[PDB]
Design a protein around this ligand. Sequence first.
Ligand SMILES: O=C(N[C@H]1c2cccc(O)c2C[C@H]1C(=O)O)c1ccc(NCC2CC2)nc1
Length: 167
Amino acid sequence: VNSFSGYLKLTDNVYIKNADIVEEAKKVKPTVVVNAANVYLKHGGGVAGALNKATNNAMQVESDDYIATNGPLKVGGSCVLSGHNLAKHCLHVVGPNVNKGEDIQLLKSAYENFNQHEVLLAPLLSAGIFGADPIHSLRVCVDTVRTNVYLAVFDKNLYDKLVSSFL
Ligand SMILES: O=C(N[C@H]1c2cccc(O)c2C[C@H]1C(=O)O)c1ccc(NCC2CC2)nc1
């Protein structure tokens, strides 16, 4: 049993809700919150910009030190950093950004990072300002992630479409 409330069970291991991931994280304090990161960990907008703002920019400060030491992530890759006031840990995952021309096949590799964590609160990867089809992202999630994932979807009309079209 866990404290995630009002989630729609899609499969054995994937759950979804129309909710603000910032508020879900503040309320649940999950072991892992996933960030929709880029390779430079520059948390400018979307999920990344939103989570960073909720940490009062502490996520960005930590991220800048990470990049200065380690260099950029790979598209499809990830790193584990602090969850600050939102979670124990933040798993920064880089899905492909279609608005940068990145290959959508890398979306499966991106979701594979979730399998290293037994339970996660996460956004649908490559949705919103990353420009990929969210119905596609949800399908890849269900077909790739085997651990227990709670997807928080910000946009109500996207959530309604994701529920209505899920096979
Ligand atoms: O950009 C957000 N979401 C979309 C997005 C963007 C980039 C990559 C992604 O994979 C996704 C999933 C999309 C969605 O979930 O609709 C978002 C989410 C929460 C939030 N909270 C603070 C506001 C003040 C209440 N702000 C923004």
